[PDB]
Amino acid sequence: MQDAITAVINSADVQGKYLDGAAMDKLKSYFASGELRVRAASVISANAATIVKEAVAKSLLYSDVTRPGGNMYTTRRYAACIRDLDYYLRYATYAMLAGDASILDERVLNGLKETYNSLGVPISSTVQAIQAIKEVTASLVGADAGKEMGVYLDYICSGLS
Amino acid sequence: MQDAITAVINSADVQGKYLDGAAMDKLKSYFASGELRVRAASVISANAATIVKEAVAKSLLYSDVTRPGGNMYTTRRYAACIRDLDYYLRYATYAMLAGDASILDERVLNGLKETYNSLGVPISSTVQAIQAIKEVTASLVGADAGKEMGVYLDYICSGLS
Amino acid sequence: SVKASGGSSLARPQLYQTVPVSAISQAEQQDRFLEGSELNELTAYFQSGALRLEIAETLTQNADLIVSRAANRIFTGGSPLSYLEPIPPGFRPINIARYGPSNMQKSLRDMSWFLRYTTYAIVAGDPNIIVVNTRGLKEVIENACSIDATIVAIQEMRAASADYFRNNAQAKEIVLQYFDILLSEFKAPTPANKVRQGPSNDIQGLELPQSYFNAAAKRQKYAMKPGLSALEKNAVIKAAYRQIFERDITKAYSQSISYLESQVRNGDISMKEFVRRLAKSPLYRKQFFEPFINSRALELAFRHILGRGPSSREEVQKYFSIVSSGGLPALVDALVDSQEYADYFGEETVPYLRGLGVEAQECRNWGMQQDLFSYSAPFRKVPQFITTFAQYDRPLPDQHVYGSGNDPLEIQFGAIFPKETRNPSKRPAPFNKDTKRILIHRGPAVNNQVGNPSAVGEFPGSLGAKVFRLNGGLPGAGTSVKFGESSTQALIRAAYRQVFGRDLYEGQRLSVAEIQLENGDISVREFIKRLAKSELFLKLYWAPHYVCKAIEYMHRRLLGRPTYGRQEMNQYFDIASKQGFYAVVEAMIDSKEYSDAFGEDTVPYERYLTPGGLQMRSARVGSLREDIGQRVDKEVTPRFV
Amino acid sequence: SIVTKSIVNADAEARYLSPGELDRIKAFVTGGAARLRIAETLTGSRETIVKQAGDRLFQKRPDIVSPGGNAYGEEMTATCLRDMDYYLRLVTYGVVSGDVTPIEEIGLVGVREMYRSLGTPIEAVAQSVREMKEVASGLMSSDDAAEASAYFDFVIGKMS
Amino acid sequence: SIVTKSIVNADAEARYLSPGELDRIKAFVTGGAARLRIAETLTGSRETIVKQAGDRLFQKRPDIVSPGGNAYGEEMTATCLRDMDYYLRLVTYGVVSGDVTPIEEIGLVGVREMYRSLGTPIEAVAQSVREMKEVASGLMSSDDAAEASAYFDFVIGKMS
Amino acid sequence: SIVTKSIVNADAEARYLSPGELDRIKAFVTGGAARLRIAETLTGSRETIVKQAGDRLFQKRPDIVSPGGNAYGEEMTATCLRDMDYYLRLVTYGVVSGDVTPIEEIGLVGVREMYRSLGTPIEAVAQSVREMKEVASGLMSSDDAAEASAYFDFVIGKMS
Amino acid sequence: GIFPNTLAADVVPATIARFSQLNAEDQLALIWFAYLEMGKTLTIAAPGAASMQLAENALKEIQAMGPLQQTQAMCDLANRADTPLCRTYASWSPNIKLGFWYRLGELMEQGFVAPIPAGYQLSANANAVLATIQGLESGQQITVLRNAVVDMGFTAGKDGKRIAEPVVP
Amino acid sequence: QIVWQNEVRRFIPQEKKLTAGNPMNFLGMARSINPAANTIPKVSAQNINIEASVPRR
Numbered sequence A, B: 001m002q003d004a005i006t007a008v009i010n011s012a013d014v015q016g017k018y019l020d021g022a023a024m025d026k027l028k029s030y031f032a033s034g035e036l037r038v039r040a041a042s043v044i045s046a047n048a049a050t051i052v053k054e055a056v057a058k059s060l061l062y063s064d065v066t067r068p069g070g071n072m073y074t075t076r077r078y079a080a081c082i083r084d085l086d087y088y089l090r091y092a093t094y095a096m097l098a099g100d101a102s103i104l105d106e107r108v109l110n111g112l113k114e115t116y117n118s119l120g121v122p123i124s125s126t127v128q129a130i131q132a133i134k135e136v137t138a139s140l141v142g143a144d145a146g147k148e149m150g151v152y153l154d155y156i157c158s159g160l161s
Numbered sequence C: 001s002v003k004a005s006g007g008s009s010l011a012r013p014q015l016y017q018t019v020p021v022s023a024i025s026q027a028e029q030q031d032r033f034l035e036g037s038e039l040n041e042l043t044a045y046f047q048s049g050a051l052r053l054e055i056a057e058t059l060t061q062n063a064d065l066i067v068s069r070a071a072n073r074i075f076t077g078g079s080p081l082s083y084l085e086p087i088p089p090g091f092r093p094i095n096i097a098r099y100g101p102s103n104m105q106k107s108l109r110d111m112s113w114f115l116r117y118t119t120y121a122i123v124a125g126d127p128n129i130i131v132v133n134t135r136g137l138k139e140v141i142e143n144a145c146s147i148d149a150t151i152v153a154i155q156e157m158r159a160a161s162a163d164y165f166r167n168n169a170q171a172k173e174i175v176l177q178y179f180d181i182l183l184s185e186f187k188a189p190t191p192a193n194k195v196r197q198g199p200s201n202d203i204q205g206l207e208l209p210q211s212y213f214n215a216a217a218k219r220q221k222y223a224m225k226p227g228l229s230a231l232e233k234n235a236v237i238k239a240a241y242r243q244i245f246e247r248d249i250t251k252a253y254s255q256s257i258s259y260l261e262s263q264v265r266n267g268d269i270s271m272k273e274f275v276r277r278l279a280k281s282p283l284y285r286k287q288f289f290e291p292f293i294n295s296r297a298l299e300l301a302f303r304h305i306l307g308r309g310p311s312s313r314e315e316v317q318k319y320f321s322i323v324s325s326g327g328l329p330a331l332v333d334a335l336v337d338s339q340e341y342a343d344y345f346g347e348e349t350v351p352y353l354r355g356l357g358v359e360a361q362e363c364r365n366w367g368m369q370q371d372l373f374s375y376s377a378p379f380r381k382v383p384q385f386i387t388t389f390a391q392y393d394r395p396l397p398d399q400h401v402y403g404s405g406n407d408p409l410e411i412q413f414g415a416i417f418p419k420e421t422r423n424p425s426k427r428p429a430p431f432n433k434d435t436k437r438i439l440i441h442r443g444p445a446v447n448n449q450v451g452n453p454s455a456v457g458e459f460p461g462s463l464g465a466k467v468f469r470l471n472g473g474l475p476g477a478g479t480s481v482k483f484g485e486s487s488t489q490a491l492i493r494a495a496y497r498q499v500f501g502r503d504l505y506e507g508q509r510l511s512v513a514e515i516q517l518e519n520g521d522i523s524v525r526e527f528i529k530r531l532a533k534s535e536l537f538l539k540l541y542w543a544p545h546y547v548c549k550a551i552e553y554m555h556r557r558l559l560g561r562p563t564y565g566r567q568e569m570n571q572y573f574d575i576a577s578k579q580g581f582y583a584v585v586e587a588m589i590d591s592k593e594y595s596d597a598f599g600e601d602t603v604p605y606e607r608y609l610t611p612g613g614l615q616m617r618s619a620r621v622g623s624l625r626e627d628i629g630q631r632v633d634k635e636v637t638p639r640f641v
Numbered sequence D, E, F: 001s002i003v004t005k006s007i008v009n010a011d012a013e014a015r016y017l018s019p020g021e022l023d024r025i026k027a028f029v030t031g032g033a034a035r036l037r038i039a040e041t042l043t044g045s046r047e048t049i050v051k052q053a054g055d056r057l058f059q060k061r062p063d064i065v066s067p068g069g070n071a072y073g074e075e076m077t078a079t080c081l082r083d084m085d086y087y088l089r090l091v092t093y094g095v096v097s098g099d100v101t102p103i104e105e106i107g108l109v110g111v112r113e114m115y116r117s118l119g120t121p122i123e124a125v126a127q128s129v130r131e132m133k134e135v136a137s138g139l140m141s142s143d144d145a146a147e148a149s150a151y152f153d154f155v156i157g158k159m160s
Numbered sequence G: 001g002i003f004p005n006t007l008a009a010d011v012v013p014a015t016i017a018r019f020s021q022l023n024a025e026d027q028l029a030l031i032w033f034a035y036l037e038m039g040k041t042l043t044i045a046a047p048g049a050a051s052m053q054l055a056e057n058a059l060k061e062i063q064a065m066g067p068l069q070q071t072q073a074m075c076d077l078a079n080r081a082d083t084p085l086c087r088t089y090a091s092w093s094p095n096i097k098l099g100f101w102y103r104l105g106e107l108m109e110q111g112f113v114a115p116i117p118a119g120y121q122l123s124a125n126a127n128a129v130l131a132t133i134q135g136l137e138s139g140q141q142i143t144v145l146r147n148a149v150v151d152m153g154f155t156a157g158k159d160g161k162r163i164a165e166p167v168v169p
Numbered sequence H: 001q002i003v004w005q006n007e008v009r010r011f012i013p014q015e016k017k018l019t020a021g022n023p024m025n026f027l028g029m030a031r032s033i034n035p036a037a038n039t040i041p042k043v044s045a046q047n048i049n050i051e052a053s054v055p056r057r
C-alpha cells in the first residue's frame, strides 16, 4: 500500500525527479493534519464496538435481513455481518491515518463484490449499514474528521457498488 | 524476551504491587541510557560485517582452525563460523538495546552448547573470537557503550562455557 | 557400531480395529467428548455384545467339528485329523500322503486360525482384523497351497458355523457376513505397497505393505472446500489450528486471526496459503519462534508444516541456512512451497502428522520424530535432529556410559544432575561394555595414569588440587599450646569438605569418628569411610538420586575422578543390587586404586575432570588464557619508531 | 514496550533494527517523563479510584451485588474490587511501558475463559473499568487524562 | 514510511493502532518540519554534493577511473555520477518518509545482483555514498547531519 | 513419615522391609486415631499455648525482653511468638507422622546457624518450647500428653 | 531492616505517626531531648545489641569535621538530604541508626560534637509527643524511637519536604 | 442483611494483607503479653573484687 508520504515518493520517483515545491506542499499538508488524524483514530478505537452497535441498530435490526429468510437471520450470519462492519471501520481508520485509499482497495476490496454476490449478501443493506457507520462516526469524532472518515467509507461503498 | 522496562514491570507484577519509587528510578535510568544505546546500535549495524571481519582477522585467521583438519577448513565451514559470529553480534546488539540479556538465553544460548558439542565446534576459539568482536566494537562505539556491549557478549561467552 | 542414538520409546501400532477404539479415537482425534454419534455406536455395540459372545462361545466349543468338516471336504485319501495343531471349477481334493506332513500341518493350522480370527472379528464388531491378515494371503500361499481347496474349506467352515444359528436372522447373518468378508478377502490379490519416495537425494525411498496401513489407526484428513457446511468449515479451521499451534488455542485462550479464517473459508486463500500466513503470524512467532533458538525452531516448524521431523543432516543444514538468511518468513515459505508439501497436502488439505502407520518410516530419525510428535515437544529447547545427525557422523562423545543425564556438574559441592523430564536434554549414545572415558588430569598431563600408571598418587603440585595429609603426628600420640591441634583439625574439616563437598552445619559432624581418628585409633581412610557410610551422606547423596547417579557422584567424591565406563559402573551397580549402599561405599574405598592414589593418611581430592567440567571452569572470560584457541601475534614496536 | 516489539520484529527477519525503528525507540525514550508522571498519579490515587469506581458500578448495576449476582456477599464484593485493583495496576503498567502488551499478557489473554468459568459477566467487568477510567480522568489534566484513557479503553474494548 | 509500517503491524494482529503506536506516529509527524528541512537542504545542493563526492572518490580510488575500470571514460563517469545522484534522491526520500522502505524498494533490493551484472565494484559504490554523506554533513548542521547519517549508513551497510 | 524412614533404611541395604519395620508401620497405622486427636488438640489451642508460653518465657527470661535482648521491643517479641508458633506447628507434624523427620527438615537442620546469625539466644528458644510443652500437656490427657511431650522433648534437646 | 510498624491505630503506631508529623526542627530537637531523658524516663541504650562497627567510620568523620560542619551533618540527617553520610546512614539497620544517634548525643554531651544552641527549649508539639513517649513502656519506647529514626538520611525513590533546618549561625 | 457499601468502604489492597508466617500476625498477642523489661541494673566493674567474689566451690 501507499500512504500520502509514500504516494508522493512514488509519484516523484516514477519521473526520477527530486522532491519539488508541489511535493513538499503535499507532504507539509499531510504532516500538518497528522494530529487530527491520530486523535480521530484514538476516538474511533475507543468506540469501535459502540459505533458498530448503533449502526446496526439504526440500519439493520427489525428489517427483513434479520427475520427468517433474511441473510442476517442466524447467529452465525449476524456475527459475520458485525465482523464485516467492524472490519470496514478498522480499515477505514487505517486509510484515514495513512491519508490514502490504497489500503482499502487491496486488503478490503479484492473480490468482495464477487464474494457477496456469490454468497447472496445484499449489497444495498450493506451500503446502508456502512452509511449508518459513517453518520455515527461523524457525530462522534467531529465534522472535518467525520468527512475524512466518510471519504474512505464511501470508497468502500463504491467498491461494493 | 524482556527488556529493562518489562523486567521491572514483571518484578512488580509477580508480587502484585504498583511501581514504587525504586522501580521508577530504574525506569528513569533506562530512559536516560536509551539515547546512548540507540546510537551504539546504529553504529554497530553500520559496521557489522567490518566488525566480524576484523575480529576474525584478529583471532582465527592464520591459525590451526583454518588449515586442513581445523574446524574452519573448507569454505562451507568458514562461512558457517562467520555467520555464527554475525548471530552473536546481532543478538548482543539486541540485548544492549533492550538493556536485558533475556533474548540471549531465549534465542542464542538455550541448547547452543550441546549443538556445538555435537558438531565438534571449538568453544574456546569461539569465545576468543567473541572477545575480539568486543574489542573491535568498543573501539568503534566508545568506552561506555563498548562496556555495555561487552556485558552481553560476555554473557554469550559464559553461556557457551 | 553406531555412534549415536535418537532415543527409543515404546511404539504401539494398531493391530486391528475394534468398535470402541474406532469411536473413542474418532472423538479423541478431534479433541472433544464423545457425542451422540459415537455414544450411540457404543450403546449399539454393547447391546449386541451378548449375542456376539454367544456366537464366539458356540464357535470355540464346536471349532473341532467345523475344522474337521473343512478338512474332510478338502482332503482325500486318509484322515486329516490324525494331527491337529460355490465350488471353484479347478477344485480337486488333495492327497494327505502326497501333500506332505508339514504342509498338512499348515493346512489344518490355517483352517483353525481362520476360524479363530473370525471369532475375534465377531467379538470386536469389526472385520478389520480379517481384512488386514487375509488380503494378500493368497499370493503368500499360492505356490504351496491350492486356492480352490482353501476356498472350498472356507465355504464348508462358513456353512457349518452358520448351521448352529437357526435362532433367527441375528446370529446367522453376522456369522455369514464375517465369513463372506473372509472369503472375498482370501480371494483378493495382493495390493501394491504404498511407496514414500525420497523428496530429494539426501532422503531414501521407502514402501509399506498395504496391510500395515489398514491395521494402523487412520489419520483423519481435513480439506477446506467452498461447498462445506459452516460447521464443517469450523471443524477444518480448528484442525488447522491444532496442527499449526499443536492445540486449539482458540478454544483455550480465544486466540485467533479472524481475517485469515474468513479468507480461507471463503476460498480467497487456499488452505496452503492459510497455513503460510498463520505460520508467519505474530501468534506463531511468539509461541514457536521467539522461545527457541533457530535450530530448534526449524525442527518444530517441520513438525507443524510437513507433519514430520527432519530426515537427514543435509536437510537440517539447508533449512538452518534458510532461517539464518531470512528468518521465520523464509523458513515458512521454503517449507510450504516445497514440492513435498504440495505432494502430500496440496492446496486444500490441512497438514497432518504422518508418522508410524500412515506411511513407511525411516530408521534414521525414528526416536527424534517420536519425541517431536509428542505434545511435550515445545519444552525441549535443545535441538534433537541436528545434534543426533551430527553425532551419527562422529565418534562417541564425552559422556557417561548411561547418558548425559548421569553427568553431574563438576562444582565444589552439590550433586546437580540434569533432570530427565525437566527441559528434556537426553543424549543417548551406545557405549559398549569396554569403552574407556578420556579424563583430564588435574596436574601434570604426563602424570595421567593412562600413560603413566605408576604416576598414581603423584601429587599434582601447583597444577592440581590441594592435598591434605595427616603427615604430622597426632596430639597425645599434658601441656597446652600443642601445635598438633591445628593440622589435625584442618584435615578433619578438609575430609568433611571432600566427602560432602562443603562443611556441615553444627551438630552434624561425626564426633566419635573424629576423636577416634585424633586418638590414632583409626586411619584417615577409615574416617572417610565412616563419613561416606554416615546416614547424613545417605540422605544427602545416595537416597535422592537414580542409583547410577548416586554411584557416579560417590565415585567422583571418593576416587577423585568420574568412572571410566561400564566395568566400574557395572560392578558398583551390581553391588548396589545385591548388598546396598554401605557395601558400595566399601567397594569404592577398599578398591586398589584408592590405596594407590590415597594411602591411610591422605584425604581424597579431585584428581581428574571430564572435558565438560574443565571447559566450564577454564572457558569463562575471566579464566580463559590468551593463548588458548587463538593466534597470538607478537607485538613489536613499529620500525619507524 | 516498543523496544521489545521492534527487537522481536527484527529478529523474526534476521536483521538489525532499521533506522526508523531506532528513531521510534529514541522518541519513546525521550518522551518518558510524562508517562511516568501519569503512572505516578494513577498509583497515588489507587484506593480512591478503586473505591469510587466500585461504588459507581454497584450503584449502576445492582443485580451484580443483589441475590443471585456473581458479586453478592462480603467476600464476593471484596473479590470484585480486588479484580478492579488488578486491572488498575495493569493500566499503570501499560502507561509506564507506553504499550498495551503488559496489560494483554497479564490480564487479557484468556480472560473470557476465566470469567466464563467463574460465572462473572464480562461486560460488567468492562463497565467497572469504565467507572475506574472516569474516576481516574477526574484527577488529571486533559492531556494526561486522554493518555490514560487510551489504555483504559483498550482494556474495556478487549473485555467487551 | 513509519505510518505504513505501523498500519501493517496493526493489521497483522487485526487491531487498531495501540496508544503507544499512535504516540509514536504523532511524535514522528510533529517532527516532519525538521525532516522536510533536511530533505530541502539535500535537494537544493544536490550538484555540489555529487560533484565533490565524485571528485574525492576518483582521487581516493583512481583504479575505478583508470583504463580498464568500469567508470573509465567521459560517458562512464557521467553514468556513475548519475547513479550517485539517484542515491541522493533515495536518501532524501528516506529522510522524508522516516524509514528506509522507499530506498529499500527503489534502489537497494538486489543492488549486488545488478552491479555484478554490470561488473561495477559494490565496494566502490558504497565508498561513493560515504563521500556523499561526508560532503552533505559538512554542508549541514550537526543535528541534521547526524539525522541524515543514519540513512546514509543504512545505504552504505546494505551496499557492502 | 515413619514409612519413608523405614523405606530409606530398607532400600539402603537393598532389601525389602523387615518384619520389625512392617509391624512398626502397622502399629503407627492402626493406632493412628490418637495421633490425629493429639494434633487436633494442639492445632485448636495454638493461640493460647503460644501466648501462655511466651508470657512464661518472658517471666523466666526477662533479659531477652530487656535492653540488649533480642526480643526487646514490640516487633521483636511478635517475631519471637511467631517462631514459637512455627515450632508448635512442626511438633504437630511430627506427632502426626510418627517420626521426627519433618521437624528435623523444616526447623532444626542448621537452626543453630540461623539463630547464631540472628543473634537469638537459642537456649531461650528451647525454653520457650519447654513452656509450650507444659501448656499443651496441661491441655491434654495423660497418654496424649506423654506422646506430645516426647516430640517436644526431641525439639528441646536439639536446641539444648 | 526489621519490619516497621507504620499504620495500625495503636499507641505505638500513633506516636510514630505523630513524630512523623513534626518538622525537621521539631523531630531533631525531640530526639535530643529524648536522649537527655534516656535512663530516667525513657529506655536506656544497649549498643552492644547492634553491629555498630558499620557506623564507626561515619562517626569518626563527624568527630573530625568542624563544629559548623557537625551541626550541618546532623541537620542533613534530619532533613532527608542527599549527602554521602546520609546515604551511609540510610543503608544501616534500625538498631545501628539508633545507636549512631545515641553516640552523636553522647559526643555532644561530652563536647566532641557541636552542642545544642545555648538555652534552647523544646517546642509545644514536640514536647507533647515527647511526653507521650515518656508515658509508654520500655519496649514500646524502643519501637517508637527505632521507627522515628529509621526514615532519616537519604533513600532513592522517595522524596518531598519543604521546611528544612539549615544552620544556627 | 448484606450491604455492599460496607464492603466497598472496607477495601484493603491485596498485597497488604498478612499471610502465614508474617510476624505482624503476632503483634496483637505481643501487645497483650506486654513483656516486662528489667530495671536498669546498677553494676560497677570498678568496685568488684574478682578474686574474692568469684566462686571458690
Ligand SMILES: *[C@H](C)[C@H]1/C(=C/c2[nH]c(/C=C3N=C(/C=C4\NC(=O)C(CC)=C4C)C(C)=C\3CCC(=O)O)c(CCC(=O)O)c2C)NC(=O)[C@@H]1C
Binding pocket: A060, A061, A062, A063, A066, A067, A068, A072, A073, A074, A075, A078
Ligand atoms: C430474552 C430471553 C432476552 C432478551 C432478548 C432480546 N433480543 C433482542 C433482539 C434480537 N435478538 C436476536 C436474536 C436472534 N435472532 C435470530 O434469528 C436468532 C437465531 C435463531 C436469534 C437467537 C436478534 C437478531 C435481535 C435483533 C432484533 C432484530 O430482530 O433485528 C432484544 C431487543 C434489544 C434491543 O435493544 O433492540 C431483546 C430484548 N433480552 C433480555 O434481556 C433477555 C435476557
Ligand SMILES: *[C@H](C)[C@H]1/C(=C/c2[nH]c(/C=C3N=C(/C=C4\NC(=O)C(CC)=C4C)C(C)=C\3CCC(=O)O)c(CCC(=O)O)c2C)NC(=O)[C@@H]1C
Binding pocket: B060, B061, B062, B063, B066, B067, B072, B073, B074, B075, B078
Ligand atoms: C589468489 C588467487 C587471490 C588471493 C588470495 C588470498 N587468500 C587469503 C586468505 C585465505 N584464503 C583462504 C581460503 C580457503 N580456505 C579453505 O578452507 C578453502 C577451501 C580449501 C579455501 C579456498 C582462507 C581460509 C584464508 C584466510 C587465511 C588463513 O588461511 O588462515 C589471502 C590473505 C588475505 C589477508 O588479508 O590476510 C589472500 C591474499 N588474494 C588475491 O588478491 C587473489 C585474487
Ligand SMILES: *[C@H](C)[C@H]1/C(=C/c2[nH]c(/C=C3N=C(/C=C4\NC(=O)C(CC)=C4C)C(C)=C\3CCC(=O)O)c(CCC(=O)O)c2C)NC(=O)[C@@H]1C
Binding pocket: B065, B070, B071, B072, B076, B077, B078, B080, B081, B082, B084, B085, B087, B107, B108, B109, B112, B115, B119, B121, B122, B123, B125, B126, B129, C293, C294, C295, C296, C313, C316, C317, C318, C320, C386
Ligand atoms: C566461529 C567463530 C567458530 C566455528 C563455527 C562453526 N559453526 C558451525 C555450524 C553450526 N553452528 C550453528 C549455530 C547455531 N544454531 C543456532 O540455533 C544458533 C543460535 C542463534 C547458532 C549460533 C549450527 C546450528 C551449525 C550447524 C549447521 C549445519 O547443519 O551445517 C560450523 C560448521 C560445522 C560443520 O560440521 O559444518 C562451524 C565451523 N568454528 C570454529 O572453529 C570457530 C571457533
Ligand SMILES: *[C@H](C)[C@H]1/C(=C/c2[nH]c(/C=C3N=C(/C=C4\NC(=O)C(CC)=C4C)C(C)=C\3CCC(=O)O)c(CCC(=O)O)c2C)NC(=O)[C@@H]1C
Binding pocket: A065, A070, A071, A072, A076, A077, A078, A080, A081, A082, A084, A085, A087, A107, A108, A112, A115, A119, A121, A122, A125, A126, A129, C258, C259, C260, C261, C262, C263, C265, C266
Ligand atoms: C452485514 C452488514 C451484511 C452481511 C454480512 C455477511 N458477510 C458474510 C460473509 C463474508 N464476509 C466476508 C468479508 C470479508 N472477509 C475478510 O477477510 C474481509 C477483508 C478484511 C472482508 C471484507 C467474507 C470473505 C465472507 C465469506 C467468508 C466468511 O464468512 O468469513 C456473511 C455470511 C454468509 C454466509 O452465507 O455464511 C454475512 C452474513 N450480511 C447481511 O445480510 C448484511 C447486509
Ligand SMILES: *[C@H](C)[C@H]1/C(=C/c2[nH]c(/C=C3N=C(/C=C4\NC(=O)C(CC)=C4C)C(C)=C\3CCC(=O)O)c(CCC(=O)O)c2C)NC(=O)[C@@H]1C
Binding pocket: C411, C412, C413, C414, C415
Ligand atoms: C541466599 C542469598 C539465597 C538462597 C540460597 C540457597 N542455596 C541453596 C543450595 C545450594 N547452594 C549451592 C551453591 C554453591 N555450590 C558451589 O559449589 C558454589 C561455589 C562454592 C556455590 C555458590 C548448592 C550447590 C546448593 C545445593 C546443595 C547444598 O545446598 O548443599 C539453598 C537450599 C536449596 C535446597 O533446598 O536444596 C538455598 C536456600 N536462597 C534464597 O532464597 C536466597 C536468595
Ligand SMILES: *[C@H](C)[C@H]1/C(=C/c2[nH]c(/C=C3N=C(/C=C4\NC(=O)C(CC)=C4C)C(C)=C\3CCC(=O)O)c(CCC(=O)O)c2C)NC(=O)[C@@H]1C
Binding pocket: C438, C439, C440, C441, C444, C445, C446, C448, C450
Ligand atoms: C601433539 C601432537 C599435539 C598436542 C597435544 C597435547 N595434549 C595435551 C593434553 C592431553 N592429551 C590428552 C589425550 C589423551 N588422553 C587419553 O587417554 C587418550 C586416549 C588414548 C588421548 C588421546 C589428554 C586427555 C590431555 C589432558 C591431560 C592429560 O593427559 O590427562 C596437551 C596439554 C594441554 C595443556 O593445556 O596442558 C598438549 C599440548 N598439542 C599440540 O599443539 C600438538 C598438535
Ligand SMILES: CC1=C(/C=C/C(C)=C/C=C/C(C)=C/C=C/C=C(C)/C=C/C=C(C)/C=C/C2=C(C)C(=O)CCC2(C)C)C(C)(C)CCC1=O
Binding pocket: F066, F067, F068, F069, F072, G024, G025, G026, G028, G029, G031, G032, G034, G035, G038, G043, G044, G045, G046, G047, G048, G049, G050, G071, G074, G075, G094, G095, G096, G098, G099, G101, G102, G104, G105, G108, G114, G115, G116, G117, G120, G142, G145, G165, G166, G167, G168
Ligand atoms: C536498647 C537498645 C538500643 C537502643 C538505644 C536507644 C534508645 C538510642 C536512642 C538514642 C537517642 C534518643 C538519640 C538522639 C540523639 C539526638 C541528637 C544527637 C540530636 C541533636 C540535635 C541537634 C544537634 C539539633 C540542633 C538544632 C539545630 C542546629 C537547629 O537547626 C535549631 C534547633 C535544633 C535543636 C533542632 C540499641 C538500638 C542501641 C540496640 C538495641 C537495643 O536493645
